[PDB]
Design a protein around this ligand. Structure first.
Ligand SMILES: Nc1ncnc2c1ncn2[C@@H]1O[C@H](COP(=O)(O)OP(=O)(O)O)[C@@H](O)[C@H]1O
Ligand SMILES: Nc1ncnc2c1ncn2[C@@H]1O[C@H](COP(=O)(O)OP(=O)(O)O)[C@@H](O)[C@H]1O
Ligand SMILES: Nc1ncnc2c1ncn2[C@@H]1O[C@H](COP(=O)(O)OP(=O)(O)O)[C@@H](O)[C@H]1O
Lengths: 42, 373, 128, 84, 50, 374, 187, 50
């Protein structure tokens, strides 16, 4: 239990590789976005 | 999907904050707290006990600037609470009860720092979930590779950690107390030789601006001494806020050289290149050639022009000649940690790893050592 | 604790007693030899550790043994003048290629027993 | 039968520049690689004829002087004895 | 004087502890030998009867 | 014309001991450190000392960069080691090196260049009449006085186990482990980091070593001891820095030496010292194993923590078959035991024919050390 | 080999280092035809030195140890074991058989297995077993160039024979007779 | 301070000498144990074949 206590096992690296590309897509495309608006504001 | 988490990077120098899944942080501002020191005479102007962050930078003439974080350690917790309140309410304008927060801190730190950080983020702000991560692991997320040794140099502390195939070797982590604040103090010391004297905490920011604008890392130290002694082509001119003009000259490449030779400060420790090489040699035999090919620079202190060539040349000199050394320095390496935080904060498989509020209630603040790292 | 107590009792009894007893006899023989050579210039030493602090006795002893003039000692009773005299004597030993380890002016001046005994033994063995 | 002990280097005798001197003779000068030492019988390090009681007797003799706490000092050189 | 007083108080403590442990070891040690002696005589009787 | 007693010089890493043959205890004990100044000397008329050697170098720790000439039992700086040897011969013992024989010690599995360089630098520079090199663990078992036993010597630098049965030592059963006091000092620095105290310079490394020596112990039950330390604050001790600052250790007292039995804390994958002793015993032949189970001998300074003997006896009993009795022999003065044995080996009349003579060295070269001594 | 490489200064202690040492053994080892003559040859010159490059990038020169590691096969007294070398082992195995069949046994000696791929193993083996054998008898060693896999090749022969279909242990037979069916069914 | 340190000196000197003898006594008991065990074990084996 002591070698890999901190992380869950059997996870695909392709998911992380996809997400980094998805984040870089916004930088390339220069997207306008706003932050999440609160429910109490709504 | 549901509500997005918050990513907050608290380095010793400047604080950065934004929403998870974003490319760049929304709020970037210095981590200072200022209080007035002179008499106040105009009746009716209103009172203000403290100045937090950027607001303290503009009115720095009549304040005594104080840093809450010193050498990567939170010394004054009240000013940290003030900084966090300012970040949450004035910079991002979000209620902290709706969002989980992910925080960053140094590899080797006292246990009480993490315990008090967890207690503060649960007890006062009432966040539903929180997590703590090492900054350099987030740098390796930002780079996007599974294997490499990463060296992060901030305003408080420098640290090297090697990671191979997702496994981090704990005994090879090296920490060095040589950072940007020490270089600023050394620049204040060596600017005395030409006649300019800066003493109060207001002029420390002027010295920091001088260091950020007109300093560079020499490729060869003695040859640059010979060149600067022979001619006046290396001098540059800067304008003070009050209108006086100073001219640095020789001291441009002597301040950042002190990272590679810490004996200028009186420190006995080795340079950053030797620290990285020693941290590589602390690992096992089979992973060393992979660590030579994936050295990653992170943190603002590595934004001197010419740091990469000097580091590559030094490590090439120290390593055996049969292998290739490449240093991977992304142009936006200042915010790399925060970018890594975003990549971590909105993974699908990461959502099971938040420290739940119920778990904190039933375990005390000691739950952060069992989880996190 | 009991094992450590008995062990350090063994140290402070046997190690300390043997070293201290040897240095007492060794000091007595050394000071007799030095008084034997120093009768020619009509100077004598009562205590080995105390009388060598000023460094004039060492200069006179080197004058006796080498038979040649050294630089004159500075007529100063300060601490730094004592250091100067002892440094002059050690330098005079240094030109004639007599090997010395861990020898310093402050070692003689502050009165280190082992270092003074080692210097006297080196002078005895390698010069005469 | 025979046990072989290897030496990775080879030393060469060089005249004084009398006192005997031995030389590293590194690999650039095409020196010999492996020097063998052969041991043809066991227990060559120990002499064959020995009484076991003697060692334990001398151990007792040395040890009980701690018990009786002697005032004995080390040997002195004869150059000090001559001047006396 | 005060330094060498500290020295000799430490001496008092250490060798007091050594007296403790040594006397206690001797006093606990004596009981075991008698058990060995009784076992030998009983063991012989069992041999001779067989 | 009586033969003069030889000189016994014990050199592990981190401490040098020296004395005369036939004596109970060594005359000189001093750390094997050499320091050089790093700051600028501005006062004229000061003494000109390039290097501070030995105990003197530990007096002025604030202005020197201390270095060790031996790393893991291997002499990595010979010209530096010559300074320790010269200071031992001329300043502490103050004897003429040309007049007495010299006996030296080393670790079992070392490169041959170490032994050859030791013999060459002893004959050529100090001009000794005769010399000998002896393995340390055999000397310790000489000091214990039994002709059959397994001895595990753990000192700063090295740990090694050798068995001996009836005066015969099995060469294939010798085991060597690079887990020693210096690694434990580094681990103590690493775990003292998280309490809130930081030590970086080597002068502070000496302070951490002093803290380890003064306040450490080995727990019989590790998990129960951790639970006791978590439940109550009774297991706490205070220490004063040379600066003068009360620090409180608490939990880390029994965690620094516990790394001896679980080397996975340091990242090393090697077995513990108990399993090392057990593996050395099981590598031997069957008919001697019982005797080797009854004559375990501890030696060296690293074995001076309180509670090592009971913990090791319990662990070996947990590993060994139940029908045998396991006895752990730990003399109170075991830290010096190796040196004591050397004095006995320097005083036997039978030994006097086996000194390496200068004359035979003159034609055999420095390679006679492999042919003559074990 | 790991133990005798310690004497030159190089140290190997973990499991990955044992794999590296095994790779070194597979790359640079050979069996000397004469141990004394080869040892004196290494004592004369330095032509018996090879350089191997570690995965770290360091270069080591093993030199004399190339023919000392496989020599433990023929002289197991280096390891301290009582049993003697392989050549007298197969000589005793031959001598335990009948006198009439020894003539075919000398002429049909076959080497197999990974360890028997050291260069020069066949000549040394033949010389030793001829020194042990009587002078009137002829010795033939058989060294296939694919001996390392030869056992598996034999298995491929045994799974293709039509009579071998009768050899198979049926699942029903195992269910009837328990796990002890293999002693009576397999020879 | 000087006189009190000098006065306590005699006590340490005398009962150090007290400690020394008891050391050899417990060593003698440690010697006495082993040969008792070996006579026990040989007697047991002879009894068994009886
Ligand atoms: N462009 C630059 N060039 C050189 N040095 C810089 C630059 N920007 C920042 N620094 C140095 O880095 C420090 C800020 O580093 P930062 O990344 O904010 O550290 P942290 O975020 O860990 O507190 C400043 O004090 C300054 O000394
Ligand atoms: N009283 C003690 N208690 C615990 N540890 C000790 C004690 N004395 C010494 N040590 C440890 O043992 C080491 C000294 O080992 P030592 O026996 O001198 O090695 P060697 O004699 O082979 O040089 C030191 O590094 C220290 O950490
Ligand atoms: N070309 C070679 N040269 C020398 N030794 C070899 C060679 N090939 C294999 N070996 C040794 O033989 C071993 C492999 O033996 P192998 O025949 O595969 O065993 P098995 O097939 O019975 O499992 C390896 O561990 C290696 O040490």
């Amino acid at each position: 239990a002591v070698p890999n206590l901190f992380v869950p096992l059997n996870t695909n690296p392709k998911e992380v590789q996809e997400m980094r590309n998805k984040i870089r897509e916004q930088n390339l495309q220069d997207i306008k976005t706003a932050g999440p608006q609160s429910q109490v504001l709504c | 999907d549901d509500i997005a988490a918050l990513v907050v990077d608290n380095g010793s120098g400047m604080c950065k904050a934004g929403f998870a899944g974003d490319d760049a942080p929304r709020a970037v501002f210095p981590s200072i707290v200022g209080r007035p020191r002179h008499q106040g005479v105009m009746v009716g102007m209103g009172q203000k006990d403290s100045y937090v962050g950027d607001e303290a930078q503009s009115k720095r003439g009549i304040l005594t600037l104080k840093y809450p974080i010193e050498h990567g350690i939170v010394t004054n917790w009240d000013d940290m609470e003030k900084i966090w309140h300012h970040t949450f309410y004035n910079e991002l304008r979000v209620a902290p009860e709706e969002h989980p927060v992910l925080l960053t801190e140094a590899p080797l730190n006292p246990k009480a720092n993490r315990e008090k950080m967890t207690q503060i983020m649960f007890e006062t702000f009432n966040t539903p979930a929180m997590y703590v991560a090492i900054q350099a692991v987030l740098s390796l997320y930002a780079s996007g590779r599974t294997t490499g040794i990463v060296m992060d140099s901030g305003d408080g502390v420098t640290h090297t950690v090697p990671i191979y195939e997702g496994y981090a070797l704990p005994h090879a982590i090296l920490r060095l107390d040589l950072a940007g604040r020490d270089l600023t103090d050394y620049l204040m010391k060596i600017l005395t030789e030409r006649g300019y004297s800066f003493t109060t905490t207001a002029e420390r920011e002027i010295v920091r601006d001088i260091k950020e604008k007109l300093c560079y890392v020499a490729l060869d130290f003695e040859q640059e001494m010979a060149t600067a002694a022979s001619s006046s082509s290396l001098e540059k001119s800067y304008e003070l806020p009050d209108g006086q003009v100073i001219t640095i000259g020789n001291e441009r490449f002597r301040c950042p050289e002190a990272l590679f030779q810490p004996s200028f400060l009186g420190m006995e420790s080795c340079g950053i290149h030797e620290t990285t090489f020693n941290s590589i040699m602390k690992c096992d035999v089979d992973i060393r050639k992979d660590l030579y090919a994936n050295t990653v620079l992170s943190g603002g202190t590595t934004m001197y022009p010419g740091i990469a060539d000097r580091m590559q040349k030094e490590i090439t000199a120290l390593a055996p000649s049969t292998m290739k050394i490449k240093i991977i320095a992304p142009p936006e390496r200042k915010y790399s940690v925060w970018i890594g935080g975003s990549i971590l904060a909105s993974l699908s498989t990461f959502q099971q790893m938040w420290i739940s509020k119920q778990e904190y209630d039933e375990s005390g603040p000691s739950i952060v050592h069992r989880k996190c790292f | 604790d009991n094992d450590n107590s008995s062990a350090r009792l063994f140290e402070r009894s046997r190690i300390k007693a043997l070293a201290d007893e040897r240095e007492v006899v060794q000091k007595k023989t050394f000071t007799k030899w030095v008084n034997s050579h120093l009768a020619r210039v009509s100077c004598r030493i009562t205590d080995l550790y105390k009388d060598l602090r000023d460094g004039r006795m060492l200069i006179k002893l080197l004058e006796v043994l080498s038979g040649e003039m050294l630089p004159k000692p500075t007529k100063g009773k300060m601490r730094i003048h004592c250091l100067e005299n002892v440094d002059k004597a050690l330098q005079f030993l240094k030109e004639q290629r007599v090997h010395l380890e861990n020898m310093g002016s402050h070692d003689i001046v502050d009165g280190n027993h082992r270092l003074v005994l080692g210097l006297i033994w080196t002078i005895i063995l390698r010069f005469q | 039968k025979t046990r072989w002990l290897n030496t990775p280097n080879t030393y060469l005798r060089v005249n004084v520049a009398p006192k005997t001197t031995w030389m590293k003779a590194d690999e650039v000068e095409k020196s010999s690689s492996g020097m063998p030492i052969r041991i043809e019988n066991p227990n060559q390090f120990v002499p064959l004829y020995t009484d076991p009681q003697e060692v334990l007797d001398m151990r007792n003799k040395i040890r009980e002087q701690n018990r009786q706490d002697v005032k004995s000092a080390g040997p002195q050189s004869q150059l000090l004895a001559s001047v006396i | 004087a005060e330094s060498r007083c500290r020295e000799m108080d430490e001496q008092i403590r250490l060798m007091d502890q050594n007296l403790k442990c040594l006397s206690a070891a001797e006093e606990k040690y004596s009981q075991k030998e008698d058990k060995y002696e009784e076992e030998i005589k009983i063991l012989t009787d069992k041999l001779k009867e067989a």
